[PDB]
Amino acid sequence: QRMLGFVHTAQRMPDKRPAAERRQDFAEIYARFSDERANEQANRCSQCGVPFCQVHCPVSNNIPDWLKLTSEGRLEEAYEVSQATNNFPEICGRICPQDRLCEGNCVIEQSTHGAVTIGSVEKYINDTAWDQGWVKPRTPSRELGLSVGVIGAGPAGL
Amino acid sequence: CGVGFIAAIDGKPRRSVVEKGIEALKAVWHRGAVDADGKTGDGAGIHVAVPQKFFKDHVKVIGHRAPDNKLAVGQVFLPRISLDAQEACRCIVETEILAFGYYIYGWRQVPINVDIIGEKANATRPEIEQIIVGNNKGVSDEQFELDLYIIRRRIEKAVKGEQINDFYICSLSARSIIYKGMFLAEQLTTFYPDLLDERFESDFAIYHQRYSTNTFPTWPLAQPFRMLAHNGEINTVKGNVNWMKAHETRMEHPAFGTHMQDLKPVIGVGLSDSGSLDTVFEVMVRAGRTAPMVKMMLVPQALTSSQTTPDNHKALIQYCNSVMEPWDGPAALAMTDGRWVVGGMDRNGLRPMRYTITTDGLIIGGSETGMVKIDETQVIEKGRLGPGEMIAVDLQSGKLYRDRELKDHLATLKPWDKWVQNTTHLDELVKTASLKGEPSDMDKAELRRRQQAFGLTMEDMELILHPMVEDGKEAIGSMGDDSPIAVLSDKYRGLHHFFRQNFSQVTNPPIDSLRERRVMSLKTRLGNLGNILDEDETQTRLLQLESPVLTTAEFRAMRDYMGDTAAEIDATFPVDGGPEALRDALRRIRQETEDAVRGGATHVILTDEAMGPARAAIPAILATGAVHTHLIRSNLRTFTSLNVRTAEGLDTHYFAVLIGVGATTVNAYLAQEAIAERHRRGLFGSMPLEKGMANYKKAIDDGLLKIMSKMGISVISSYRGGGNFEAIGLSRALVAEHFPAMVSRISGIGLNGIQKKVLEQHATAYNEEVVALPVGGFYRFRKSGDRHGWEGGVIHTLQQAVTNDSYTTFKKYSEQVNKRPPMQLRDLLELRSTKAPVPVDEVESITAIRKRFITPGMSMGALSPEAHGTLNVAMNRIGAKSDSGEGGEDPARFRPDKNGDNWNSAIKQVASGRFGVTAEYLNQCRELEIKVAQGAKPGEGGQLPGFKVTEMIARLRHSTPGVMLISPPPHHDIYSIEDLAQLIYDLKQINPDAKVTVKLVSRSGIGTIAAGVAKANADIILISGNSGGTGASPQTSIKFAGLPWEMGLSEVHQVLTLNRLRHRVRLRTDGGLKTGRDIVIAAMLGAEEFGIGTASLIAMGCIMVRQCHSNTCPVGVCVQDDKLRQKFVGTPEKVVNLFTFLAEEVREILAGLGFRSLNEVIGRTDLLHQVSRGAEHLDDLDLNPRLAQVDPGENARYCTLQGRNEVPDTLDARIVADARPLFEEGEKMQLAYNARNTQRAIGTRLSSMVTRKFGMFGLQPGHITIRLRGTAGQSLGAFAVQGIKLEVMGDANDYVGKGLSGGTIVVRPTTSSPLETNKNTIIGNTVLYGATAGKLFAAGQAGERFAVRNSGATVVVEGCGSNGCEYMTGGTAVILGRVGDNFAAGMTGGMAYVYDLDDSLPLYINDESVIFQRIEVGHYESQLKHLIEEHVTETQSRFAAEILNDWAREVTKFWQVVPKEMLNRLEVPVHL
Amino acid sequence: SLDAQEACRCIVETEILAFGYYIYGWRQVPINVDIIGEKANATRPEIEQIIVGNNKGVSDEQFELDLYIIRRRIEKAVKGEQINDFYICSLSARSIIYKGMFLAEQLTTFYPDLLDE
Amino acid sequence: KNGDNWNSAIKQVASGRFGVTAEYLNQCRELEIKVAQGAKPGEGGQLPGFKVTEMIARLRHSTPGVMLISPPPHHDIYSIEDLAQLIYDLKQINPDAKVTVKLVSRSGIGTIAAGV
């Protein structure tokens, strides 16, 4: 559908477990979106020119493009668009503080309409792609005859 | 300004004809341009028959013998400065005339009187003489005329050989003579006393007076010409001359003979449009045809697909359209063959023409129906001329042919119907083509590799291609263009980005393509060009396509039909060619094309399917330009066609430029491949592929029509190969060599830059493993795309600095703006003074500078009420002027609030729709403004979605709630510059205190338009740019139309200074102004005031969302919904702080330079230098064309007069001096005067006084009544309020009841006139244009465009013309007669009743937006009854009396027309 | 007219670039029109200068010959289109000419360039 | 209220002064002295005894149902000096109006006109 539905919909993050139950285990506290809810929450985007959601994201993903390609089915192309500019999308969507980077500067967030839930849609579109084998390693075609060394196995190293 | 003609029907010479011609010339002084000198004119001319007895008596007196036959008299202009060039001209004329054997009687000096000419028209006056040549060989008359024409052409060529200037032959014939010059109209018989003789008698006479746009007159440019007289202007001359250059190389006729060799360059140099048209007219007439046939072949009629015309006329028009390319443009013609006398109109019927027959067998025609005084009991029939109509007089037989009789007589000469059957269509060819040969689509990898090679991103397929295939219409954007220009860019911008489109300002009107689509044709013909001087069946044997764009299957069918006559040409250059491979490839292809055409090939297919990893593709535009220009220069374009197969064609602007350069048919296969590939993935849904292709083709054709209609061209055959574009950034040599006629005022890249860009993109595409397309930024900002003017940090910094009120943050913003790489023309200029800096506090105050900024107009339809009111209250607080824009205004805002806020607006606009223009809307402002063209969408009308129209805006514009409101592209009032002068006179009459501003758009050729509008007593000029914002408009018009204001402003300033006119008008610029440096640069270039616009919106909260058209802007700036309007965060102090900072920056800069006021820096261009970007970009831009300094002289470089430029005074003054008891005592009155056609806008000033005193509805109807007897002027009773009643006995010229506001007008024939009231034209074109309330009862037939944009008026007329009741919105209109074609077009509100006796309405009506039925409800019958009763009571007609007498049997003859949108909103349903 | 100037400029640039020399640009000569009379001012032409550099590295005499040929070709081409009020006061790498219709003593007043050091 | 003003721009000073008051002379633009009428020169206007309704009786300050015959002379104009005096009076009471004298055609009117 024509994706400008921030007027007649309300923002709502995915399922959460209550506090009296969270305190026991060590698992996560949120859950993955459902299909009909992700296709709804990714529809509140406005495809605004000069997208602030991208100016303030340190890796600068093409956020409106996969937000569009998600709101119309077409999940595989959205995965391609998201992965082609970020190596660990799901890890980022899980840990990246969004209230200060992307969700905190959305155009509809500055106007008290709430913010498009970007990181949760990142998780959704990047984990539903893992289960169906759309992820593949980038083996080099022609092996070049050189060797490079790195120190450390953190995010930068990997 | 005007044309006119007088003819004796029977054909007997008499002095009364010349007497009436001079009397008619004596009464056109109100339309011309008045001058303070009193002697300076701008052209005048008369054209009559030769007085044989005069010259024969002269010859007798000299001493010769009076010959038997008719004489030949030539009138020549010789040089006056040197006494030796005269002798050379004389000996040339005598050695060329005596070469045939005719006897020369001698020369005669015409008596003149040089005490009446001005000074500027006298310094270039030529020596006027006459030569008397007699015929002694005894040859017939027609052979004698042919010899004289050949001799004239030979003399012209010979005198051009010796390069002698100031030489002209005004006429050389044995039938007619021409007296013309550069004097005033009334002083014609004073400069030429010969016409005061008693022996000058003729049977026909033509007269013309013109209106120039400059003040440097030259005598050889004064009409009438030789067998033509023209009023208006022709749009397509750059394209018609290029087609004549190809037609010449094959024309020949046995009448001329060998001397044909001396008539090959038929169109010389140094002529106007009406001169070239006249030359081709004469060369076609002198070869056998007759004047009606030539008029039909040059300016044909609109070939309509309606059953309202017999098939004979259709066949004739088909033949005429096939043989020759039409000469479009607004044109009223009064031409004269040696035997016929014709008066004709163009295809659209813009200019007016009205005629009259007397009982003396005398026909008088002209632009105004009151020029020649005629006793009112001598007329037999009055009439008009519709679109394409004509009226002719046969002098040799003494007969008068009206339109229909002339067409029926002309459809008899040749069997046209038997001839037209030779043509073959293409749909038959694609249907008989077997369902075989379907090739296989390319691979996804191959398609992506071929798309990446040209720069097609994924956003050119998700944004501008999906809507085309889905719906059938182009995309829509909602903001200006802030992307860099082509040459200053850094990505791969295609070559079609360097060509800006064209459009028409006041000199020509655009054409509406949504409603007047029946007069626009997209026919294409292969195998058409040939001998244009023949009449045979082999002329109409060709192939005809219904659209210049072809699909792949249609292309294959056409190729198989062509067969072994086509020749394919490669268009690829080797990537390993070297540093000059592209030039070599161009050479190669332009040689192979010529070598193949000489070998019998009659079709050229220029393909580029050989593009691979080692061959790059030549830009298609360059290839087709080179090929077409070479074929034209070598006299071979007349033999073949030109078919192009492009791989980059995806948008409508591509096809436009390819057909404008010269291509015949354009094929785009890659777009079709992409559509098929996107379809097989299942993105469009459930629609078949053929439906998608049909939708795409329909969208492309509609976009082509839109681009074509911005200039005024209604046919594609005369638009092809004309060069209706402007190149910005291409080198002068390249354009002048490969493109026919385009202007590149600044040189740019040559061929090496193009080659470099092409090779870089090709290598990137073909040596890198491509897996997807880049997202790309051209319409929306992306980090990988190009740079934009408004980024994120800039917006945030500006909003912070405006909210928190910290000047340091504003300086931070300004520095961030002024630090980016160059993006616009004003980024290469640098300020450099020579004085010493002064202290800052010494410069003028901030108030005196803030009073120089204004905010532009932004309609209430686009913006919200809160934002509009906020801007208005913020700009009235610092002392500067605001603007309201189109869309009207709220009257409750006319008084200051209780807190002191003033929500009014000091500048009211008069748009093309006249959506809120009332009599009170104009008396509440300090400066009026006429909007000719907007910056974002030039040559078009503003739009408004159907859901943006709430109840409040519906009540404010007097429209229907919930219907798309699209403005008309043209003005319906401004069809030339004399109409602009009339409109400015009207506006200055209605508001005696305000100034009139004319708003234009930057382009090439704006200097002459500005010099013309400065003579119409306009006193403020506004020059917009190409980067201005808008509410909603197509994307191609946003990105590919206009020019930067650096060009327009610097052209207007110089042209105005050159004509000694700068000291009268002010200059104002806007579009892309962000900082103080921009303002100082604009002030140096010549401007005085400035408009800001978009930046202001950013100060109130707008964050460049670019969804204004969708009615869902989150902040709530351009929204009409309520839940979103509740989010507004604007505040006037924000705008005040913005303007304060912007003025303080200018003060800082002026202090740093060394001046103490803006007046000291205006016009001082020499304080600007041009710096280069570096030695690594290699662009040869030279901005010197805008740094040239024209020295002013005595006057200053800016406006130096207070108050508006005053205008003459009409009859209204006397009325104000007579009805004083109404204004002091408060009582009724009754006045009676005599109206003459030289009195304009009768009853407008009185309306102003009444509005200021009582208001619009303060007086009962008929409180003050005026009775006039005679032909009223133009705009009679414009802007009349309730309480005023005008009663004219006679007729009105035009614009009667324009902008009515509650008044009442009654027009009826005089009591002693023996005329049928229902069969004579009584009023003219454009009646009740944009009326809001009142009544109008006429007892005759109206003109064209009757009751356009009616909103509340009520009119009862006894007839109508074409295009009547167009785009009406409210009121009731009763028409007791016949109507014209395209009736009730675009109507969206109101009701109509037509009294059809012949039952011919279902053929004329435009039955798409309105439904017509028969009256079945009594409540609507009583309405009609009361309206006709009121008509009978007012005008005392006899037709309506008869209709009222026999009511029961005539009620069943009325058709009721009701719009579709009002079918479920009315109170009483029209059904049962 | 402001359109004949553009035609003259494009003709000059398309004829100079046909040999291969590099055009640096145009310059407007500073003038002072307060000293000319009225009859000599109604026909005053627009004075400009063009700066053409030599990049092919040819000798001086060959360069002068090329410049003379280019001047003749430009004159013929502009005569072909029948454009009046066009003149080339000089085109060379050696000399320059400052001339006009002013008084003798007012030469350095109309042309302040000669007052340079 | 239709603006139809029922006033009259010329007021007469008859021989009877039947309604001449101070307001009657300040509500005009242009005055008129009537010396003799065209039909009955050297005579006063008459009005029958039954023509005098109550409205006319109130408008003329008279008795209802009584014949009203104006006096032939003026009792104010016995010679040209008294005419000058009356003209001075009329021009003093109304500072904006003009004074019109109405005569009847006969022989010897030239000297009377040169005197007035």
Ligand SMILES: Cc1cc2nc3c(=O)[nH]c(=O)nc-3n(C[C@H](O)[C@H](O)[C@H](O)COP(=O)(O)O)c2cc1C
């Ligand atoms: C939303 C919007 C609506 C506009 N409406 C009109 C209009 O109705 N009439 C008009 O002449 N110009 C209209 N304009 C153009 C402005 O008058 C002005 O030309 C433009 O804003 C200048 O662009 P700038 O702000 O970049 O300087 C509109 C502009 C915008 C952004």
Ligand code: SF4
């Ligand atoms: S979240 Fe807001 S800023 Fe980001 S893309 Fe969507 S509408 Fe634009």
Ligand code: SF4
């Ligand atoms: S959550 Fe994802 S899109 Fe948002 S800032 Fe982090 S990495 Fe960027």
Ligand code: F3S
């Ligand atoms: S781009 Fe338009 S939709 Fe509103 S936020 Fe700005 S005015």
